Amino acid sequence: KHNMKAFLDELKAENIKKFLYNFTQIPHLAGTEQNFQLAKQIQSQWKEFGLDSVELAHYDVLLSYPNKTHPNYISIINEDGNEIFNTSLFEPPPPGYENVSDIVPPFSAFSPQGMPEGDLVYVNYARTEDFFKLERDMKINCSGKIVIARYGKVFRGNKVKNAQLAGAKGVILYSDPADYFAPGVKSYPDGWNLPGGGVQRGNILNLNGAGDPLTPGYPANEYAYRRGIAEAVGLPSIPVHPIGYYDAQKLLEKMGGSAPPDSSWRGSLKVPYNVGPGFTGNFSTQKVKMHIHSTNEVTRIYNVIGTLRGAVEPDRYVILGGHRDSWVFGGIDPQSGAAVVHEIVRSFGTLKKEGWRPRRTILFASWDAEEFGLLGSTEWAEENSRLLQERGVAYINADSSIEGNYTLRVDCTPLMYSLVHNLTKELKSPDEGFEGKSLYESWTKKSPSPEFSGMPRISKLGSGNDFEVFFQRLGIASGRARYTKNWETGYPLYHSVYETYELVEKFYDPMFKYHLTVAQVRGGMVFELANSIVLPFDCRDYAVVLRKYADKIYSISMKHPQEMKTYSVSFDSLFSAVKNFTEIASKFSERLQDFDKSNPIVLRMMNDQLMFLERAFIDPLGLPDRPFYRHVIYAPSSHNKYAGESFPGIYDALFDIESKVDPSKAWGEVKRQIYVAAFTVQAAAETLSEVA
Amino acid sequence: KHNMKAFLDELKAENIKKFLYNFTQIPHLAGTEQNFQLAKQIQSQWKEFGLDSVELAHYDVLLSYPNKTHPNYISIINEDGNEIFNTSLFEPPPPGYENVSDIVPPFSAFSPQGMPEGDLVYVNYARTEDFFKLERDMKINCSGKIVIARYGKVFRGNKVKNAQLAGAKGVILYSDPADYFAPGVKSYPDGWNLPGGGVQRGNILNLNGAGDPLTPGYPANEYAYRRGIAEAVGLPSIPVHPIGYYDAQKLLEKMGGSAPPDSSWRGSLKVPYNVGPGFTGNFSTQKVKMHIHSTNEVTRIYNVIGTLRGAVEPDRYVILGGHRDSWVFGGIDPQSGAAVVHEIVRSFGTLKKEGWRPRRTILFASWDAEEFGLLGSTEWAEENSRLLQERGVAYINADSSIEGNYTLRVDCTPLMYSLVHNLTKELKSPDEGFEGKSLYESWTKKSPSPEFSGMPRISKLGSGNDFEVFFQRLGIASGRARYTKNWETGYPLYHSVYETYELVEKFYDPMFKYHLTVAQVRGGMVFELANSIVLPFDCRDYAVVLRKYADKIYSISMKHPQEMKTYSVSFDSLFSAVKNFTEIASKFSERLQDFDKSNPIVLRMMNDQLMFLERAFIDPLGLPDRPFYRHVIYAPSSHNKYAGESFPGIYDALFDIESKVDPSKAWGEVKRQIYVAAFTVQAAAETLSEVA
Numbered sequence A, B: 001k002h003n004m005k006a007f008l009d010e011l012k013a014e015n016i017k018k019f020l021y022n023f024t025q026i027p028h029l030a031g032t033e034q035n036f037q038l039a040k041q042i043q044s045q046w047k048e049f050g051l052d053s054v055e056l057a058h059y060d061v062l063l064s065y066p067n068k069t070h071p072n073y074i075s076i077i078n079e080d081g082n083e084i085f086n087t088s089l090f091e092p093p094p095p096g097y098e099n100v101s102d103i104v105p106p107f108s109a110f111s112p113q114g115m116p117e118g119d120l121v122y123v124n125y126a127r128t129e130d131f132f133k134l135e136r137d138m139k140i141n142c143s144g145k146i147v148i149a150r151y152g153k154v155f156r157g158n159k160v161k162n163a164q165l166a167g168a169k170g171v172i173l174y175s176d177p178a179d180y181f182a183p184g185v186k187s188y189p190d191g192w193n194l195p196g197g198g199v200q201r202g203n204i205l206n207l208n209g210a211g212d213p214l215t216p217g218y219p220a221n222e223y224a225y226r227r228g229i230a231e232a233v234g235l236p237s238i239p240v241h242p243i244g245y246y247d248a249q250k251l252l253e254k255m256g257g258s259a260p261p262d263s264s265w266r267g268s269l270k271v272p273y274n275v276g277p278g279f280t281g282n283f284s285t286q287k288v289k290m291h292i293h294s295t296n297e298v299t300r301i302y303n304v305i306g307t308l309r310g311a312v313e314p315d316r317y318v319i320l321g322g323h324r325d326s327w328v329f330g331g332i333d334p335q336s337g338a339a340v341v342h343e344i345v346r347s348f349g350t351l352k353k354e355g356w357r358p359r360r361t362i363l364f365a366s367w368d369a370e371e372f373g374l375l376g377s378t379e380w381a382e383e384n385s386r387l388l389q390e391r392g393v394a395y396i397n398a399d400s401s402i403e404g405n406y407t408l409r410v411d412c413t414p415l416m417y418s419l420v421h422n423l424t425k426e427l428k429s430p431d432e433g434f435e436g437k438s439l440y441e442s443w444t445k446k447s448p449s450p451e452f453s454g455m456p457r458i459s460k461l462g463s464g465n466d467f468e469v470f471f472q473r474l475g476i477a478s479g480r481a482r483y484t485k486n487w488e489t490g491y492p493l494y495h496s497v498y499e500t501y502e503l504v505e506k507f508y509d510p511m512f513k514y515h516l517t518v519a520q521v522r523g524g525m526v527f528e529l530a531n532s533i534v535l536p537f538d539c540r541d542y543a544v545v546l547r548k549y550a551d552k553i554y555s556i557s558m559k560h561p562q563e564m565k566t567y568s569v570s571f572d573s574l575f576s577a578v579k580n581f582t583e584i585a586s587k588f589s590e591r592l593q594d595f596d597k598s599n600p601i602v603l604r605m606m607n608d609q610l611m612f613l614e615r616a617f618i619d620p621l622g623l624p625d626r627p628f629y630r631h632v633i634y635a636p637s638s639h640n641k642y643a644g645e646s647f648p649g650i651y652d653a654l655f656d657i658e659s660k661v662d663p664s665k666a667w668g669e670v671k672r673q674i675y676v677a678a679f680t681v682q683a684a685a686e687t688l689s690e691v692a
């Protein structure tokens, strides 16, 4: 038989290991020759593996790179102007790689150039609430200061936007051992902890789904018209640079002004974590100075697009996608995912060599420039939006397969909950002490949902990865899955030079059994999605979360009873819409089960309803000021791009509403958002009614 | 057999006459009780005719009405302030109707209230070029003046926008006998000409596809959140009123200042057509004063939606739609169309009673509030956008069946050219002297295309009617057809009380044979569209017009060679895209002919490609500042809503470009629009490539 079990048993841990080792010997930074060569390799091997076509799709996009002859760094400088302290120029390379060249030094991608100088202020995680604390309660003013903030909690881009909206003239990011050093574990090479000389790279854009900063809406092709830098989307206007905890200790040890306001502003370094501004008395006339000489430049990037044509519905597309570019070696991010996708492609190809084809078309992608803002996926989706809108069944992402070795992590649309539950009951748990148990069982035991005894946690999709365009812009049902750590107690070597094949083989997954599990989940999902006769989506799962979401957003609004009375703020229409969806979805399931199994057209009609249901939640006007976030139920949090927010139009219109100077207008906009949500939920529901 | 000929022979001229008489005894103004009652009647009779379901869909939209106890009118007023001249309060009612009540008097719908007073300026047709002439060459300044303009050439809304952007404080519209009185024909009741006391009603919004001014994007339902009047879409900010040529003669006979600049500013009244400002010497201190007391109010409107479920593809929708509301009796506009749709419904129902069903679903609509801005169609499409986007095959409009008795007029998407050519070769010409000839032959002889010997003229779709939302917002293939007058030499009684059943029966179509022809064309189109196994669209027809359009827009740009060199303005990408479309379309036709006729899925795939092709030309970002005009190839002219413009993003960016103060920026935007167009044409083309 050529069935799922066939596909699944053909997958090998050992192949995944080889591929990972092969993908991590040299750096594969976006836009560099080596990442082009790795693209040519994937392309040619997807061809050898049997795909019907494998092409490169290239775009010319805005990237960012340090100046090789003029390095970035930060100083303490004295009243004369002598730089008595310099941050490092590079991370100590790890054992055996100390002669690899082309290790990009730590930098904040897309920082503008500058040499500002001034007094520090320490802003904790640079969250929206951290600035509230700072401005509102503590009365400290960051205007014209240089803020220093620890990584963690939120996407670094948000941090930078917040600092900028607070009047800062520079930002310094560092990794605190409280957030990046697990107790009792050694620093790399002897453990998986971050060393004091380790630094996290990463971009600091606020793109809000735009893709290439120069070409929002349209693929960055050869004739593309490009905005000028000044109209570019998402670029920070103050310089920014990241450092390790050794360098940070030196910047923080002299801090004066006010004490931290409480213990949650305190990391683990032996320093006061005073907030500032400026240094204490003896050193009060010393200053901090940044030297940033990074350049932005339009650079060519290459996606690899593989096609396995479907036998019955070739005009329906299941997409398995993940990126190939890395900040350095990408031992985890992303090559632990890419090696999984490679083996998934190999296994699908093995069946195809024996004459099998999936029912629907499967598209396989190796995206470029993800690290620089999801630019490869997004340009490609901008280019093929019409095909994807009308033919796209689902998108399964495939970035890092592990960030932990404790349990499975799944984030996806409600429409895929049941598929995930089912797939995992059929899969072996790789966990110590669940030998012979199902993956469902181990996952459900180690990671239970808040809502339902006997069910595992499944998160909602945030952003910060290549499914963003497919889900929040286009309304294609999306999911992702990986191994992760204990939810109670990213990973410490995230985006640092220390993230290597040895990191993975020695400390995360020596047997490659977690990787293999993750290949089964990803691959199994894609298999079901590309092969089940009826698409494996359950609309009733959407009905349940919508109720939960409407309860939640109503509760936020109920913190303002007085205002709800004065302005006649009602959630009746939303609750009505969600009830209707529940009823209609339920009648649709009955039909989907009772229908005349033999009829292709009726089957196609009902599959089209399932396929267009996610699509139904798209509003072609977008959310306010974020035209590329069009999904009404899910957007990335406006305070944290990694986190998903439900009913975001309403959440944001309620956020901090008590601080608005014109309440009438603000509550007017809450009501508008309520209407949009109710309408959209009703409209979605109606796509599941009988069609005529 | 139950084939087209069956459908077509069941249609009767005599039934159309009865229905027309039945629809025109009383006024059916949007929002009034009588138009609700006519809706209940249509609904109940579509039920008796056999449709599977017939519902009313209602919305609460902004309308506009004169104050019944405080009438609008215009005065000449003297230095004291005595109103020595008053325009009429109503049109003389026609013979036999002089006791009908509820004849809304002439008014400009959506005019704000006011009593401005000042000197006249006469601005010819109030076209963009007329104001150019006036400001640029003649150096006359309309700021703070009251402009008077004759109807004709362009949509009255544009006229009003132009006057307003010229600083006017009021606008007076009138019908000049040069534009509304055909020589040698009597005034109504004794001919079809407009009498001196006749006046053209009509709205004066600039909605740009928005629908209800208060709820752009979303259906005006019970819980809808509504903008305040001040943020409403499309409302004029100066008062406006329309008058007949008797009243206009009195306003124009005293005009002084400058002479008309040439003979094309001269109508047929015996007055100088001086431009002004103000009156000549003796009367130089007299003034013109408007009294406008119209109110805008949210009012309920009712569409009637009839469904004839398809046997094979019930989830594919062919829509036959036209409006039911009238300014007064609607003898031509719209009941000459509505009576045709009624008979079309009856005939389809006759076949269904005998057990036949169309292959795809047919939806029949009687729209409300078309006269007030296409509001019924648009709200309904806003509400069902998701269904329509994914299931909509085509939309055939059905407003007035005749505006003439000389020949056929067709305006439609290129995709329906071949269907129209074929249908009409099978239809009898109703024309004197083409007895026994085909409709194609008479049409082709009386109305030849500019481009091809042996082919008839087919216009491109403009706007000013209910297909606007379906075509330019949603990208559903649309057409329309009616009898019209000689293209060499609207109709004079357009939007006046004189437009009655007697007008039609006596002077336009005594035999109802032109009506019947138009029912065959409309109905025949809908029949083919709902029944042919392969959708009757030819993508190669799009390829030919795109070349023609690209030649045209290139020629406009070539009036500025110097600027094309300085700014590197190239049309290469557009021409490349159009070539590609041509090639790909051609390969698709070969497949569409060669494919395995027996396979439902392959048939469905290829029909979906045909169906989504029009959809492919939609840009979800819209055109600049006109977010509800999303089609890249066709928009309504920005200077005339009735006329279609091809490549409108580029046309508008080239318009008047030599007057822009920052050429670099302006030519930057030409290039941007070029890129958008090229990209979109390529993307559309690619929807017709093999799918995998």
Ligand SMILES: *[C@@H]1O[C@H](CO)[C@@H](O[C@@H]2O[C@H](CO)[C@@H](O[C@@H]3O[C@H](CO)[C@@H](O)[C@H](O)[C@@H]3O)[C@H](O)[C@H]2NC(C)=O)[C@H](O)[C@H]1NC(C)=O
Pocket (backbone or CB within 6 Å): A573, A574, A576, A577, A580, A678, A679, A682, B222, B223
């Ligand atoms: C959830 O589904 C129900 C249908 O079972 C929807 O009920 C509809 O609710 C509106 C009120 O918001 C009703 O409007 C009323 O229509 C009558 C004419 O039939 C009119 O006289 C009233 O002034 C009023 O406008 C409507 O009849 C009712 N529709 C049906 C088919 O029963 C409800 O709206 C849905 N919820 C949402 C958010 O869509």
Ligand SMILES: *[C@@H]1O[C@H](CO)[C@@H](O[C@@H]2O[C@H](CO)[C@@H](O[C@@H]3O[C@H](CO)[C@@H](O)[C@H](O)[C@@H]3O)[C@H](O)[C@H]2NC(C)=O)[C@H](O)[C@H]1NC(C)=O
Pocket (backbone or CB within 6 Å): A222, A223, B573, B574, B576, B577, B580, B678, B679, B682
């Ligand atoms: C019309 O269709 C043709 C395909 O037959 C398109 O040709 C493509 O044109 C672009 C140039 O604009 C070519 O780009 C080049 O790619 C190579 C790598 O293969 C690279 O070295 C060059 O610097 C350059 O970017 C592209 O290869 C060529 N594509 C193919 C498949 O031949 C043309 O773009 C289409 N026109 C439009 C407007 O889309």
Ligand SMILES: *[C@@H]1O[C@H](CO)[C@@H](O[C@@H]2O[C@H](CO)[C@@H](O)[C@H](O)[C@H]2NC(C)=O)[C@H](O)[C@H]1NC(C)=O
Pocket (backbone or CB within 6 Å): A418, A419, A422, A536, A537, A538, A593
């Ligand atoms: C997940 O698994 C269950 C199999 O238990 C599926 O539910 C059953 O599906 C069949 C229809 O094929 C019905 O006759 C049964 O009544 C269903 N049982 C229950 C409890 O619902 C469910 O369909 C699967 N989900 C997905 C997405 O496949």
Ligand SMILES: *[C@@H]1O[C@H](CO)[C@@H](O[C@@H]2O[C@H](CO)[C@@H](O)[C@H](O)[C@H]2NC(C)=O)[C@H](O)[C@H]1NC(C)=O
Pocket (backbone or CB within 6 Å): B418, B419, B422, B536, B537, B538, B593
């Ligand atoms: C309009 O009419 C012609 C019928 O002459 C159609 O063209 C023919 O269609 C069949 C495919 O059914 C081909 O085998 C012939 O080769 C075609 N002839 C020509 C000259 O093209 C055309 O398909 C019809 N158009 C539409 C929309 O139906």
Ligand SMILES: *[C@@H]1O[C@H](CO)[C@@H](O)[C@H](O)[C@H]1NC(C)=O
Pocket (backbone or CB within 6 Å): A021, A022, A023, A025, A041
């Ligand atoms: C990866 O594998 C390919 C082919 O098997 C090979 O050409 C290339 O040398 C490999 N890379 C490394 C680092 O071994």
Ligand SMILES: *[C@@H]1O[C@H](CO)[C@@H](O)[C@H](O)[C@H]1NC(C)=O
Pocket (backbone or CB within 6 Å): A067, A068, A069, A070, A295
């Ligand atoms: C890098 O800096 C050096 C001087 O220290 C300079 O010559 C060069 O312009 C810079 N390179 C870029 C790409 O900006």
Ligand SMILES: *[C@@H]1O[C@H](CO)[C@@H](O)[C@H](O)[C@H]1NC(C)=O
Pocket (backbone or CB within 6 Å): A083, A084, A085, A086
């Ligand atoms: C820091 O860097 C600059 C430039 O290389 C130099 O002038 C200064 O001495 C350095 N300071 C220290 C303390 O090493």
Ligand SMILES: *[C@@H]1O[C@H](CO)[C@@H](O)[C@H](O)[C@H]1NC(C)=O
Pocket (backbone or CB within 6 Å): A192, A404, A405, A406, A485, A507, A508
């Ligand atoms: C792998 O397994 C054990 C937990 O059972 C743990 O002690 C070790 O921390 C895990 N490795 C990593 C990198 O989390």
Ligand SMILES: *[C@@H]1O[C@H](CO)[C@@H](O)[C@H](O)[C@H]1NC(C)=O
Pocket (backbone or CB within 6 Å): B021, B022, B023, B025, B041
């Ligand atoms: C139109 O026809 C219907 C039913 O045949 C009837 O109830 C109504 O009276 C008619 N209207 C007129 C003006 O005759």
Ligand SMILES: *[C@@H]1O[C@H](CO)[C@@H](O)[C@H](O)[C@H]1NC(C)=O
Pocket (backbone or CB within 6 Å): B067, B068, B069, B070, B295
């Ligand atoms: C109509 O005008 C009269 C007075 O001349 C006034 O009482 C009334 O307010 C007006 N009606 C409306 C709806 O504005």
Ligand SMILES: *[C@@H]1O[C@H](CO)[C@@H](O)[C@H](O)[C@H]1NC(C)=O
Pocket (backbone or CB within 6 Å): B083, B084, B085, B086
């Ligand atoms: C015009 O109308 C007003 C108000 O009805 C009146 O005072 C005036 O006499 C009228 N003028 C003429 C010339 O009939």
Ligand SMILES: *[C@@H]1O[C@H](CO)[C@@H](O)[C@H](O)[C@H]1NC(C)=O
Pocket (backbone or CB within 6 Å): B192, B404, B405, B406, B485, B507, B508
């Ligand atoms: C109808 O027919 C004849 C032209 O043959 C024409 O003289 C008359 O004007 C036409 N009627 C109208 C309303 O155009």
Ligand SMILES: [Ca+2]
Pocket (backbone or CB within 6 Å): A210, A211, A212, A214, A215, A216, A217, A218, A219, A220, A378, A379, A382
């Ligand atoms: Ca882009």
Ligand SMILES: [Ca+2]
Pocket (backbone or CB within 6 Å): B210, B211, B212, B214, B215, B216, B217, B218, B219, B220, B378, B379, B382
């Ligand atoms: Ca609306």
Ligand SMILES: [Cl-]
Pocket (backbone or CB within 6 Å): A397, A398, A399, A400, A465, A480, A481, A482
């Ligand atoms: Cl992932």
Ligand SMILES: [Cl-]
Pocket (backbone or CB within 6 Å): B397, B398, B399, B400, B465, B480, B481, B482
């Ligand atoms: Cl029409």
